[PDB]
Design an enzyme around this catalytic site. Structure first.
Site, PDB file in Angstrom:
ATOM      1  N   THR A  86       0.376  -1.190   0.202  1.00 29.33           N
ATOM      2  CA  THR A  86       0.007   0.147   0.506  1.00 29.33           C
ATOM      3  C   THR A  86       0.676   1.530  -0.066  1.00 29.33           C
ATOM      4  O   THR A  86       1.663   1.253  -0.394  1.00 29.33           O
ATOM      5  CB  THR A  86      -0.887  -0.877   1.472  1.00 29.33           C
ATOM      6  OG1 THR A  86      -0.228  -0.467   2.543  1.00 29.33           O
ATOM      7  CG2 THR A  86      -2.641  -0.889   0.812  1.00 29.33           C
ATOM      8  N   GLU A  87       0.547   2.775   0.045  1.00 30.91           N
ATOM      9  CA  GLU A  87       0.833   3.513   0.430  1.00 30.91           C
ATOM     10  C   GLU A  87       1.848   3.070   1.163  1.00 30.91           C
ATOM     11  O   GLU A  87       1.191   3.769   2.440  1.00 30.91           O
ATOM     12  CB  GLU A  87       0.348   4.703   0.472  1.00 30.91           C
ATOM     13  CG  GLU A  87      -0.692   5.332  -1.446  1.00 30.91           C
ATOM     14  CD  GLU A  87      -2.416   5.788  -0.879  1.00 30.91           C
ATOM     15  OE1 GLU A  87      -2.182   5.915  -0.213  1.00 30.91           O
ATOM     16  OE2 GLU A  87      -1.854   7.338  -2.117  1.00 30.91           O
ATOM     17  N   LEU A  88       3.276   4.173   1.330  1.00 28.98           N
ATOM     18  CA  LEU A  88       4.306   3.908   2.479  1.00 28.98           C
ATOM     19  C   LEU A  88       3.773   5.483   3.380  1.00 28.98           C
ATOM     20  O   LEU A  88       3.631   7.076   2.761  1.00 28.98           O
ATOM     21  CB  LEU A  88       5.183   4.495   1.832  1.00 28.98           C
ATOM     22  CG  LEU A  88       6.011   4.553   3.484  1.00 28.98           C
ATOM     23  CD1 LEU A  88       6.507   3.330   4.100  1.00 28.98           C
ATOM     24  CD2 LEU A  88       8.502   4.667   2.818  1.00 28.98           C
ATOM     25  N   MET A  89       2.829   6.024   4.298  1.00 28.22           N
ATOM     26  CA  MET A  89       1.721   6.827   5.144  1.00 28.22           C
ATOM     27  C   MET A  89       3.203   7.165   6.290  1.00 28.22           C
ATOM     28  O   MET A  89       3.467   6.997   6.435  1.00 28.22           O
ATOM     29  CB  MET A  89       0.990   6.433   5.409  1.00 28.22           C
ATOM     30  CG  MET A  89       0.025   6.042   4.812  1.00 28.22           C
ATOM     31  SD  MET A  89      -0.499   7.415   3.489  1.00 28.22           S
ATOM     32  CE  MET A  89      -1.226   8.638   4.519  1.00 28.22           C
ATOM     33  N   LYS A 136      -9.367   2.016  13.691  1.00 27.74           N
ATOM     34  CA  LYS A 136      -9.379   2.575  14.191  1.00 27.74           C
ATOM     35  C   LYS A 136      -8.185   3.860  14.232  1.00 27.74           C
ATOM     36  O   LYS A 136      -7.758   3.999  13.270  1.00 27.74           O
ATOM     37  CB  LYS A 136      -8.136   1.447  15.744  1.00 27.74           C
ATOM     38  CG  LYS A 136      -7.418   0.405  14.985  1.00 27.74           C
ATOM     39  CD  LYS A 136      -6.512  -0.202  15.811  1.00 27.74           C
ATOM     40  CE  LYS A 136      -5.749  -1.211  15.093  1.00 27.74           C
ATOM     41  NZ  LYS A 136      -5.093  -1.967  15.945  1.00 27.74           N
ATOM     42  N   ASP A 153      -4.923  -0.197   6.250  1.00 26.67           N
ATOM     43  CA  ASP A 153      -4.717  -1.317   6.322  1.00 26.67           C
ATOM     44  C   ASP A 153      -5.867  -1.831   6.503  1.00 26.67           C
ATOM     45  O   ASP A 153      -7.259  -2.250   7.519  1.00 26.67           O
ATOM     46  CB  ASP A 153      -4.803  -1.248   8.152  1.00 26.67           C
ATOM     47  CG  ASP A 153      -3.001  -1.487   8.856  1.00 26.67           C
ATOM     48  OD1 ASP A 153      -2.834   0.067   8.076  1.00 26.67           O
ATOM     49  OD2 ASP A 153      -2.309  -2.063   9.980  1.00 26.67           O
TER      50      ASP A 153
END
Ligand SMILES: Nc1ncnc2c1ncn2[C@@H]1O[C@H](COP(=O)(O)OP(=O)(O)NP(=O)(O)O)[C@@H](O)[C@H]1O
Ligand SMILES: [Mg+2]
Ligand SMILES: [Mg+2]
Length: 273
Positions: A86-89, A136, A153
């Site tokens: 996924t995107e690296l936040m 969450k 997630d």
């Protein structure tokens, strides 16, 4: 920095750089060779029907696009583990924000809650619907610029092909009581959103007074609210939380009820009767 793994499509590389580690997921630093923008090479803990189901669910998550949902690049089973790209936040989550500033400004709380609600309405209106099953504040990432948030997630999510899901997984502090009964629907993302809104209004893990996950299970399944619930100062936030964490799923508010709530639109001026 030599790469140590490669996605099956040959697009994403893995670097041996651990950024984070949780109960079932280890975040490595990855690269998108198409654009040379870094991504998140996440590795999660892993029958043929479930394997075939897995290949179809990943292809649908791979096609999602929404401004409040983290981009799902790819996912597959490796060698015993599940890789998820996924995107690296890199702006921190709503948990790191709460752990830093302690108090979240009321206008900031509503603006981000509405975007979360739009992110949940997107998943629930897909064909077939998608339950996050792990909502969450640490799965809600701040995105630059303008600080919009996206839900990430998706490692525990399911596509609702039948009427109900059954598997008992997620984070105990945010799991609806009917999840332990192995028969639930998309109303558990509303329950978790009630605990997200409780976390943003109190800046602590719900049920923090419990000693372990079993105590949380005992309280929730008995219809007992967490102790931080009575610590909410804003009565409007308290009633919305109560409308989301109701023990009976059929009594809880819906996403449309939340999106239309007069609370999430009070930033137009003064509070008037
Ligand atoms: N996409 C991401 N980009 C950057 N950092 C991330 C990303 N996903 C997770 N992290 C970080 O990695 C840490 C560990 O991941 P985490 O998701 O907590 O593992 P987990 O506990 O197994 N799954 P969860 O149920 O969400 O807690 C988190 O606390 C984040 O700080
Ligand atoms: Mg975690
Ligand atoms: Mg997470």
């Amino acid at each position: 920095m030599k790469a140590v793994a490669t996605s099956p499509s040959g697009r994403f590389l893995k670097f041996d750089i651990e950024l984070g580690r949780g109960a079932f997921k280890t975040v490595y630093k990855g690269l998108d060779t198409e654009t040379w923008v870094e991504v998140a090479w996440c590795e999660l803990q892993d029958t043929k029907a479930e394997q075939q189901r897995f290949k179809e669910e990943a292809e649908m998550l791979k096609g999602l696009q929404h401004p409040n949902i983290v981009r799902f690049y790819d996912s597959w089973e490796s060698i015993k583990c599940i890789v998820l790209v996924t995107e690296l936040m890199t702006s921190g989550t709503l948990k790191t924000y709460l752990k830093r500033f302690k108090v979240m400004k009321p206008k900031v709380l509503r603006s981000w809650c509405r975007q979360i609600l739009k992110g949940l309405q997107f998943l629930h209106t897909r064909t077939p619907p998608i339950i996050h099953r792990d909502l969450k504040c640490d799965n809600i990432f701040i995105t630059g610029p303008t600080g919009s948030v996206k839900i990430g997630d998706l490692g525990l999510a399911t596509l609702m092909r039948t009427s109900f899901a059954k598997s008992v997984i997620g984070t105990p502090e945010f799991m609806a009581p009917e999840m332990y009964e192995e028969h639930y629907d998309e109303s558990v993302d509303v329950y978790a959103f009630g605990m997200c809104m409780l976390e943003m209004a109190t800046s602590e893990y719900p049920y923090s007074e419990c000693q372990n996950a079993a105590q949380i299970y005992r309280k929730v399944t008995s219809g007992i609210k967490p102790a931080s619930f009575n610590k909410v100062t804003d009565p409007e936030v308290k009633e919305i939380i109560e409308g989301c964490i109701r023990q009976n799923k059929s009594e809880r508010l819906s996403i449309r009820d939340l999106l239309n709530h007069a609370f999430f639109a009070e930033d137009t001026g003064l509070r008037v009767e």
